[PDB]
Amino acid sequence: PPLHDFYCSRLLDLVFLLDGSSRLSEAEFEVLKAFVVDMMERLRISQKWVRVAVVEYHDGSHAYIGLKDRKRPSELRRIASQVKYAGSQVASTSEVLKYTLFQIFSKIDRPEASRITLLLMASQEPQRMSRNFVRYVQGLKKKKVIVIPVGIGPHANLKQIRLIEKQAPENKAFVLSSVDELEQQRDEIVSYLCDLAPE
Amino acid sequence: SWALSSGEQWCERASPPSSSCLWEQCQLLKSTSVFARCHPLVDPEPFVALCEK
């Protein structure tokens, strides 16, 4: 039952990567949570069709909902709205990428759907921590994973953006200037994700 | 060309000031998160250029 207009009721595996850095203020992080909730609201949330997982990284993954979890979509909405604001001084795109590659998506058990990761970067990971970034991106590519980078804030590292796209055919970047643009581009983003529909 | 001379005041052709011009806080228009929300609406390049001047 689509809430307003959309229901991407197809086999899909989806993971979110809500950034936990201090760059996104408390209000900005709340807007991001609203984005993720309103996003999953328009998807057929169930292990049969759509698997959703939110993974806040604040220099360490903080998965609140796992793609293997099976609960009422209302409960998942509540949990997503309840993601705490870490407010860390430095996030780590590479660390969360490794987490999803090894501990979230390393035990393929449902090829019917596809693997999509929404990296909502809002801060620049220090170069010293970018040693294995390309390696993990390529590894996810091998695992049939499409990374959709989202450059939320002006400080969002853009070099990594379009570099994730460079090492993949379908990796699309949604570079935004503020969280407000998320509400504007919500329909476009859901549409794009449903173009790569596993049916 | 739009000067409006009055009875007691008479227009004279104004000319660019004869003067010669790192803070660089003007970058805030494109670096700070709050300001960048406007980039979709209004381009900040002219404003930052005026600020540099």
UniProtKB/Swiss-Prot annotation, chain B:
Highest taxon of the lineage: Eukaryota
Name of the molecule in the record: von Willebrand antigen 2
Species name: Homo sapiens (Human)
The gene coding this protein: VWF
Residues shown, of full length: 190 to 252 of 2813
